[model samples]
Target: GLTEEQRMMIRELMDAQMKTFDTTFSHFKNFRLPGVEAAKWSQVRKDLCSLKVSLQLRGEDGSVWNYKPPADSGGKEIFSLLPHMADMSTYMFKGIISFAKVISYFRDLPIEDQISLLKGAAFELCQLRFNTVFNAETGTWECGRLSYCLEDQQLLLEPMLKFHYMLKKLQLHEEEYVLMQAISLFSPDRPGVLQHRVVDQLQEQFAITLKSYIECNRPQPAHRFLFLKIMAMLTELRSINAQHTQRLLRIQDIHPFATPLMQELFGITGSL
Candidate 1:
């Protein structure tokens, strides 16, 4: 197992480089992806809740925004299930919640460690969960009766589309998705965490499980880099997680009323 350490070191290297790699090393002078100026938020109803709560996305700009509800919602607001977590019926709650009970691994972690992992990975978990519902053909996240397209993520639209299709292209299986979910769910270095080593070990354990899946369950011919991409998805999730924090915080400062659950989860104290 010469490459075992090599793989672990590379995985660790990839993990470090994944977070550290950004525009700083880019050769291009002007490497910016524009969304704000390109397509400003066009309100449907004058009194519309911002990003999460708003069911309507009226963007007459790029073809990026186009998702007609399968049928009239009949005045049912299922899309707001995220902002208001009253309904535990959906996978959004079930998947994220049950991961803790998966082997009872999370129960042993410190309460503070538990908080940061969920807080850190919640956005990614939601994003990954949403990937399951994403209608690549229709360009919408078709969840229950409610649905939405990429534009809702706004700044996250590009990477979301890129990786959504990238992952979609491979046609990931159930095991792959769950393992990926587990890997992302257990992270140590997120915002602030006390038991970094423990959570980090857990992350490695989950990461190794994913590697095992690719190697054994799904047999690979020589030079097939499938595991490479699958593992890298967590890195992408972290990247998206960073964007989400900044984006959410910026939104929080401007209009705190719309984000109570959001505020609480991220430890953001908000206003009226």
Candidate 2:
């Protein structure tokens, strides 16, 4: 139903977004460093952990001294970081909302639809953005300024690691990750959607574009399955998001400190 100029405008917008992602994720395309060099990469890991902690504490107008949790710490110790985790989650949620506002169609959706879509999409998008923090292959979790191997932070990542580990095995290209994020953002099945056909059409275009990209850049016959594999990964990603939301609900049940935005974004209402 769009005019030719309208279609061209969307095409140009998508092109610009793709170019921006290419530059943003250039390092991730070849992110793997040999497992043997974990020690050498320790500094990089540490830096990421620090960044998370900084963001987590930014709203508090205070900060904590940097320290690494012991690899063998119990789940209780990891749970102690729950408040910081909530803070970080909130920060990421706001960032995702801001990103959505930059997209004309998403921004123009009705307020009820916007909230509904955010409830469905925020955690998924946050987890997607989190991919930049740790190397899946390396099995590391960047806490703030330091990074620790999965073995060291099992309590922290828990079930989420299972999905991330699978992603590590796939070794998706950086462009593929960006394309997948875009696909997830345009999802139409979110509750209370006002223009589902438009959302569905946008998501379909993204899927087609991702498929075409894989075909062009990866001529290997085996790589033909990569797009399908990436699509399948979304199921596991949503499962992880559900698990995280459940955990957050448990925390909020006791503490009740989560902001209204956090509650809405995570779909944490009693009926949800």
Candidate 3:
């Protein structure tokens, strides 16, 4: 069973994500809140259900990324893709910081663990957000008017497309998507993480929440191996994330990143 603090963490976590996007998911808004007598786990599903996985594009209204624009142009060099990458990284970085502010559990961790978790998990977290819009079949990311692709990034794109395939096919409910990110973020093995016990406890509980959540949403016969498939992506993500970090180190070889957060999080400039 989830504790009062973790329940509130999940509740505020949803709030943080919606705030990050500067919009609410209408699906969630229209649902009635459970009575005080309702099951606690029920509330977790509803809270996470409210999240709509998408990035907040700067200077554009929340609706910008909603359209399925034609891919009139595609495949920018990773170099040219920097602007969009920078914008997305900025939004995600802010979202993580916001969670720390609102969730005492995360804030209570020593500064070392906080930064380690944020820094270690940021890339993998963004991958989940990015997969929301990726069209694996077409090998493009449909973010509003800027339809996307990979040119010189073929190495990353190949594995990336593969990683995106399962996420795409799974059509993860908003709850499952965010829960995965939470589990990834609370991992104990992150670099320089000292508060191992708290981090592990949180991660383990969230992982249980995730599997339990899956069982509720997709039953065994209806969705055999669903949990297995979902958990496997965490591994796939590490492969993709490692590839990402490799490319990141070489970024300045082409052109420096416009987003400082990207530099700080992904760049080895100050490895912890």
Candidate 4:
């Protein structure tokens, strides 16, 4: 049972989080774009993307870059900034698959092999997450389309952050310095580098605490419980969908062009 003190604290925390979301949603409710917004909070951005991709969407810059993919593109859907994104997404996925292989190999071996496996996994995960989460296609991936761009800010964390940082340490090449800067700018919580104080201190700490509590209460052995919880959490968010809402949209439905695009362009229909 949750202790009175714990329950009250949790209730307050949940209330505060919900309050922030509610205020944000209120603004979203006033969004006047043409398409119907999804009743589901998660789909609102997707609805908007649908419109943006269709050239019916506008941005702060008053530009409309969305359109049908080129005829030669094989009806596969090419978002804005095509070639750049296509390369990045493919590289990132390749990196992740390599990590998966390392993990499988290490688990069957001795303790040292496990450490080696983890090191490899960290490298590859960083490589993939960084390279894959950007470009004009980031939104499309959310709706089941494969991505082909690298400019989107969503891929700024995890593997990307760590990958550049690692490359900087290794002094790979002159180009890495530029990459280092790009990585820093891309990081939502930069200058703190690996610390990324806001994320670790505010966001990740809460997540860790919750996981710890659940692990303590689980029926499994203590050691295995932590492992299971950690793996589950990492895997859940490790996928692109982990923080899709956070990365993809700053305002769910309130943007001038977002709502209509979701419905008319992307084909989502629910709330408006």
Cα RMSD for candidates in order:
13.4, 10.6, 13.9, 20.3
What is candidate 1's CA lDDT for residue 192? Answer: 77
In angstroms, how far off is 56's CA in candidate 1? 9.3
lDDT of 3 by residue, 231-262 (tens): 88887887778776665554443445546676
Candidate topping lDDT: 3
Taking the tens digit of each residue's C-alpha lDDT, what string does model 1 give over 1-272? 22475345335433432342221223212212112211212221111223332222233352333333222242323232333322222224334544544434566887777777777776676676667766677666554434454333353345656777767666776556766766777778786788888888987877776676566656646426778988777798789678656654543344333344455567765533
Q: What is candidate 2's local distance difference test score?
A: 0.60
Candidate 3 TM-score versus the reference: 0.68
Candidates 1 and 2, the one with greater TM-score: 2
Q: What tens-digit string does per-residue lDDT give for candidate 4 at 1-272?
A: 54564444344443332332221112312212212134443354333342222222334465543334332232223223223223333333333333333322223344433333332233224332333222222323221122222222434354423333333233222222222212221222322234244323433433443444454455455345443433343343334332433333433333322233222212336555
Answer with 1 or 3, whichever has the higher TM-score: 3
Q: Note the Cα lDDT for every prediction shown.
A: 0.54, 0.60, 0.62, 0.32
The candidate 3 region of ten consecutive residues with least summed lDDT is 25-34
lDDT of 4 at 140: 31
Ranking by TM-score: 3, 2, 1, 4
Residue-wise C-alpha lDDT for candidate 2, range 126-238, written one tens digit per residue: 77766656566565555444343443344344556656666766666765666666677778987678889888987887777777777767878767688888898887787
Which pairs of residues collide in model 2? 45-147, 46-145, 46-146, 48-144, 49-144, 49-145, 50-144, 50-145
Residue 42's lDDT within candidate 3 is: 38
